[PDB]
Symmetry: D3
Subunit: 88 residues, 6 copies
């Protein structure tokens, strides 16, 4: 059933730069679950887990072509909990 | 803005027994924020904070006329965070 | 990959009483993941999530034939995270 | 240096009943650190860790001569963190 | 009543640079409560919530004239919980 | 007895640069417990506490000769909890 999640909205130069694969790889390394997509207003990451380590490493290890201008976070409710981390 | 909350649904003999005032007093003692109401399917408690101590003490210190048959919990999103604990 | 879990060891009159199904139902209601088994020294519950609400409700809603004499907890590492709650 | 702690104030029939040793044993089982004392207004327990499992088990496994009428909690700051659980 | 807070002490080139407004805006975006002031030994931020995302973004999005040389954290007790984030 | 810990594996130019003393000093400032060592595949930090603030500050305040290329984290179980932070 339902659970508390977090949505991150990452804006900047975040498309055509390997950003979704970067996020996926970070999520795999950190054993995170949820998804990533680019919906036209940056990159949206939805996580089951707390985002803090992910956010630290998002910034520090940003791909060389990418540039992160802002990140916003908000809570939301998962309808079903994710069992993988996927690119959508 | 928004924040992760918890809603508790408490069922049993939970009306006409001092239940809403009991919840209010417990919330005051525990410095909790949110609200309590009786909507016809038991008593609904919405909290800003984690509910664990509240739940322990709800059961242990249940008013003598009351009887708690079940408690369910689920997350939800507060649209604005509460600054008091109120009976609604 | 790996994650921090909790193992609970529940002892008492906890077999022949509907205890494993009780635990399963509680875990379903609380959206918990992991497993339950009876290994001859009581009932072992392994969870992905924090156990506090589960423990409160384990005691308060213990099946009428059952009796809980003790519960112990310890951390452990999940090799793979559970995606369901199962009786083993 | 300093850290966030919790103080619990447990009132009732909580002296002459094995209460301080009960608390000590519970703290040992739960791998908690801090102290317990009886200062004339019940029993005060100060912990380094979150108190929720402790509180559940305090109530459920209360010694047979004892009776717990109320428990209050408040935060405080440890000046030095405790490395044992002691009766004071 | 009282609650566990965190105080951050941010030192460097952190005055005359838009630092207090920067902190305020970050706190608004992150839905944080507490206050910020410059007391002559850098900038002090007191929060009700965990500071981790705030700290990540403090560093990454530091105003261009500012420079953060160090940040220290310590717990403290709020006498009353804050309902806004304010510049003091 | 046992408790949930975190192990961090920090790789890059992290030897001959004051890295272990840097970690020790950070851990002292943050009131952390555990240890640091260089085992030939970077620097391993084991903590009792959550690592998030530590990780933020590890990156931001990296010694000038050092360079951090990657950090990985995983949970593990402490056999005994640490009471100091030590260089091993
Ligand atoms: O288009 P991407 O590869 O930057 O996600
Ligand atoms: O009707 P109440 O007093 O039990 O809430
Ligand atoms: O044998 P059980 O039904 O008490 O688990
Ligand atoms: O006096 P005590 O043994 O109940 O603590
Ligand atoms: O003086 P401030 O604008 O840097 O706070
Ligand atoms: O060899 P270290 O000083 O960089 O730890």
């Amino acid at each position: 059933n339902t659970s508390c999640g977090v949505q991150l909205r990452i804006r900047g130069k975040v498309q055509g730069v390997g950003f979704r694969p970067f996020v996926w790889q970070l999520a795999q390394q950190l054993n995170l679950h949820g998804d990533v997509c680019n919906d036209g207003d940056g990159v949206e990451v939805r996580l089951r887990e707390d985002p803090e380590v992910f956010l630290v490493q998002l910034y520090q290890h940003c791909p060389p072509l990418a540039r992160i201008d802002s990140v916003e976070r908000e809570p939301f409710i998962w309808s079903a909990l994710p069992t993988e981390f996927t690119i959508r």
